[PDB]
Design a protein around this ligand. Structure first.
Ligand SMILES: Nc1ncnc2c1ncn2[C@@H]1O[C@H](COP(=O)(O)OP(=O)(O)O)[C@@H](O)[C@H]1O
Ligand SMILES: Nc1ncnc2c1ncn2[C@@H]1O[C@H](COP(=O)(O)OP(=O)(O)O)[C@@H](O)[C@H]1O
Ligand SMILES: Nc1ncnc2c1ncn2[C@@H]1O[C@H](COP(=O)(O)OP(=O)(O)O)[C@@H](O)[C@H]1O
Lengths: 31, 54, 375, 31, 375, 375
């Protein structure tokens, strides 16, 4: 089994952290 | 003695034929074991080597 | 075998043929756009033997066949071989008949009009499809990824399209159609593997190289550093097993091939690479558009599946792009097959059921009708 | 028997998300 | 005996002629390819005595005859003697007149064209056969063996051609003709038996050595190991009883004769052997053909009778052959008779009844017609 | 024996070697690329007898030697045997020591890296050459012809490389490497001469057929019409005298051989022929390049000496080319010696003295240096 669990969890976490980070950055950057 | 020797030669020829078939099947099974093993060990070495960031 | 007159959806490209029915989330089957023909004289009698083989048949019997792809960098020229591919796709795989289902096919926004007209003509005249609709690959790529705004980076086997779309509208002056594709990478890899002592020039050899590329290749985030180590040590080499038991060990060719996407000069192309075309397609758009397009560069098609490709393009675009603004690449797992999915999405929209060419309008006007009815 | 790459980064990327999410809420409250 | 106008089938080499009626699994008559002539002055009268003897007649009265064969290294050099052999075989033994039956004759694809023209001409002009076809020996060997794909190593009396076929198609660029056959193996043995003190040079003597070879020799799985023992111990000698009651014992010479198949230098030939040609014919086949031919290398014709040859050949090919791939040699019971059997299979196919040259087309064009009509 | 420290020029191919001194207009030492070895057991003693023979020695004593070629399809496979060819060529025939004569070697543009570095290594470590250079045959062909632009068809014994150059610059994306060469044409002739009753397989026989091809074969401008008469009448036959006083008479085989250049399927090759590859080398270059390459189609190397080939090619490219456009072939009598001539021109060029790798740079970097310094 290739890491199927990871392929999707990877997409989930990269997207969720990137979105959360984009929110963190905007939340402050908006001033 | 000949009929018995022919029985043995033909018995054995029929049996060796079956054994040869067993080898052909066995090797295909072997290849499946090796190929699936190879595919799994390698798909993981590569899946984990590329999928390192999570 | 379907219990409803669902549209059939198929992406008939220069590489693969993807097909399934509208409403699903994936093609049911995928196979190469190949029609093969014997290149040898027969000597045994009562052997059956076809004049031509299609798809997986063409590859299965390829030892004595020359294999041709009817679609040339996105356009259909050998419509007779494609009739065979469609018949196989529909009847021997999906087990559907276009006569009982409307059919959706797709092409890039700057694809020559001849492609849309010929696809329309054959599906109506040889398959008797009740309706047709030629979709835009860029439209389908963003439907599958979930965007109304973004850049379609469809970097597959045929051609890279590079089109900005904003709020569902095309921004066509900024399209950078580029003659750089997965098909060129296969031939380039055959040439650099020749440099290593393993020459590849024939169809069988080309299919072997396409398999090497698909299984061993990547681009990497930093090319020069990956190159420096791959060129210096066996630690970055990977072997490949050929159909005849030969083994080829591949080093920096593993990425030097794919790197052509960022450095097209490797194959003699006058281009700055896919990251610059993405960048310029955004830079040619208004500043109130650019803020949304830079944050939504969207991957579709093959080659987008290479390790380091989304990071490599995002890095280069970010380097070329202004600060403060965020630059991002969207590269979902539904890669390489996402345009098919977009086709399913379009085919099944209620807002799309008025977009079909019916087999009435078609015969009154002829196939040129697609040029006015689809988009 | 987790592969370190997957265990360590899944947790770190999960944390980037959680931390960024909290930062977004915090910074948004400030801004 | 035959109750239908079936095709006649007849395989003709420098060794023996096999013949029978199409549809059977065996020839019904087998004769030596020999025409004998007396070399003495008669003194008694009213003794009968022929001007020439054919087949079994030639061997039965051989004590005072010189024996000659019509076929050399695959071709007919003496058409008159072939007519006598076929006349006897068809009319006296099989009790059939070819005038009422189509006839199938055989050759490998590189056989000089004169051979196919002579086979066609004799049957149409001296036998008045209503139809003719010349088939490929490799084609017939694969039918007999139950294959459409494989390499036929026809290690007969005259010439070995080693012809590769895939899906019933010729791969002619890869036919590696070899100037080594059973007739040369006999000559090697005559010279080595001379070293042992037994000179064999006249017709009766030449026939004895050929008979010794066929009954006493084997290849030897390991030549050097078999020789280390055979050269050291009398326990490996086999005793052959000569026609006059005297005996000859043969030791390592028992295997050094067939060893020429793996060592052609033994008879002055610039070749490594039958396993080398087996390997080269497959080596030049398409990379996507090789896997099916390596798993199906086929023994055909005689010399394959060596109970040492089955393992000797697979070991020698496996040693040169690619890894991963299954390497296998087919050594069917239809050996030494595979061409005739394949001939019956081809001749009796419904799909083959349109392949015949008729005795209309023949007279309008002449025997050169076989070159355009058969393959 | 030379009066200047001028670099040697040595065009070492899979066929023959043309060697001489830079600055002259012709090679001085021409040898086949052959190393011969005895295949027989000696009986007399005090007969001299070498372990190996080279060049002309290999051919002069060939009656009992097996002859091998150290170079195959453009590369050295046996560098020890090339050291033997080089030692003889340099010290006995050219009568020069490489120690004071840098020496230019030749290669094809997509030739494996291993060959260019191995040639460099032998000259620096075995011959102690003060400097080295490995040249592109296409470059040399264009210098000899008085051009900086054109398609070089280097159609020799090994590989046809089909390589375009414009304004002195390589256009590598358009190189069409083709696996069809003079060695295959020889093999094809051996097979069709077998069809005529004259099988050729051994070293003496292989050398004879190559000589037959060079002396008797041609292409002419129309294969089918030439075949229609050659196959019907003795009026198009030519006799060749074999070394023992016997002769062979050859008919349409005389043109069917070289026709493989236009019909590669004759040897089982998946190719449309040399004119298709010439065409693609022109066509795959930019539209403002194409006109100059059409007007400068350059014949170089072997096979360019088949009667009718320069015009046959101009006709065959014209047939694929757009109308109005002028397609022109450059085919001087200095055909095939043009690579040697260019080697002389380049090696002695003042503008190219800095291009030589010295035996300083060589040891610091190793033989792979040729890949970075020559082009
Ligand atoms: N493992 C892989 N990595 C990168 N690309 C791949 C991989 N597997 C398949 N592809 C490529 O996908 C391409 C198929 O073209 P495709 O993108 O599906 O057409 P389209 O542009 O309409 O979407 C081929 O060039 C193929 O080599
Ligand atoms: N036991 C054996 N040992 C050696 N050779 C054999 C044996 N049995 C058969 N052969 C050889 O079979 C040959 C004749 O049959 P065949 O090969 O079918 O002729 P062909 O195929 O060329 O038409 C003879 O050379 C004979 O010596
Ligand atoms: N008249 C001719 N007919 C056919 N082939 C020729 C003729 N003259 C030369 N050639 C072929 O030239 C080939 C030698 O290849 P070549 O181009 O000279 O390699 P290189 O450039 O390294 O010397 C041989 O196969 C030879 O038969």
């Amino acid at each position: 089994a290739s890491m199927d669990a990871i392929k999707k969890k990877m997409q989930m976490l990269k997207l969720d952290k990137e979105n959360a980070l984009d929110r963190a950055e905007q939340a402050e950057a908006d001033k | 003695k000949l009929k018995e020797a022919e029985t043995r030669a033909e018995f054995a020829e029929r049996s060796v034929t079956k054994l040869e078939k067993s080898i052909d099947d066995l090797e295909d099974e072997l290849y499946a074991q090796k190929l699936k093993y190879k595919a799994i060990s390698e798909e993981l070495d590569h899946a984990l080597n590329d999928m390192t960031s999570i | 075998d379907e219990d409803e007159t669902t549209a059939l959806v198929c992406d008939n490209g220069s590489g693969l043929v993807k097909a399934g029915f509208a409403g699903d989330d994936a093609p049911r089957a995928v196979f190469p756009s190949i029609v093969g023909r014997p290149r040898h004289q027969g000597v045994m009698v009562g052997m059956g033997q076809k004049d031509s083989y299609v798809g997986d048949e063409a590859q299965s019997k390829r030892g004595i066949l020359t294999l041709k792809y009817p679609i040339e960098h996105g356009i259909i020229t050998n419509w007779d071989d494609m009739e065979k591919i469609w018949h196989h796709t529909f009847y021997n795989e999906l087990r559907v008949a276009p006569e009982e289902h409307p059919t959706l096919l797709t092409e890039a926004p700057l694809n020559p009009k001849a492609n849309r007209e010929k696809m329309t003509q054959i599906m109506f005249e040889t398959f008797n499809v009740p309706a047709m609709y030629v979709a835009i690959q860029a439209v389908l790529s963003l439907y599958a990824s979930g965007r109304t705004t973004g850049i379609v980076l469809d970097s597959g086997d045929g051609v890279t399209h590079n089109v900005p779309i904003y709020e569902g509208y095309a921004l066509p002056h900024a399209i950078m159609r580029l003659d750089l594709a997965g098909r060129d990478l296969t031939d380039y890899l055959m040439k650099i593997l020749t440099e290593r002592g393993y020459s590849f020039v024939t169809t069988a050899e080309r299919e072997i190289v396409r398999d090497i590329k698909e299984k061993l290749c990547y681009v990497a985030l930093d090319f020069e550093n990956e190159m420096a180590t791959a060129a210096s040590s066996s630690s970055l080499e990977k072997s490949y097993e050929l159909p005849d038991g030969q083994v080829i060990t591949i080093g920096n060719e593993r990425f030097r091939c794919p790197e052509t996407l960022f450095q097209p000069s490797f194959i003699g192309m006058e281009s700055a690479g896919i990251h610059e075309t993405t960048y310029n397609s955004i830079m040619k758009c208004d500043i109130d558009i650019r803020k949304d397009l830079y944050a939504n560069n969207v991957m579709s098609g093959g080659t987008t599946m290479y390790p380091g490709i989304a990071d490599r393009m995002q890095k280069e675009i970010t380097a070329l792009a202004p600060s403060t603004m965020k630059i991002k690449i969207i590269a979902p797992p539904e890669r390489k097959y996402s345009v098919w999915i977009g086709g399913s999405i379009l085919a099944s929209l209620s807002t799309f059921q008025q977009m079909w060419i019916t087999k009435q309008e078609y015969d009154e006007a002829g196939p040129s009708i697609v040029h006015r009815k689809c988009f």
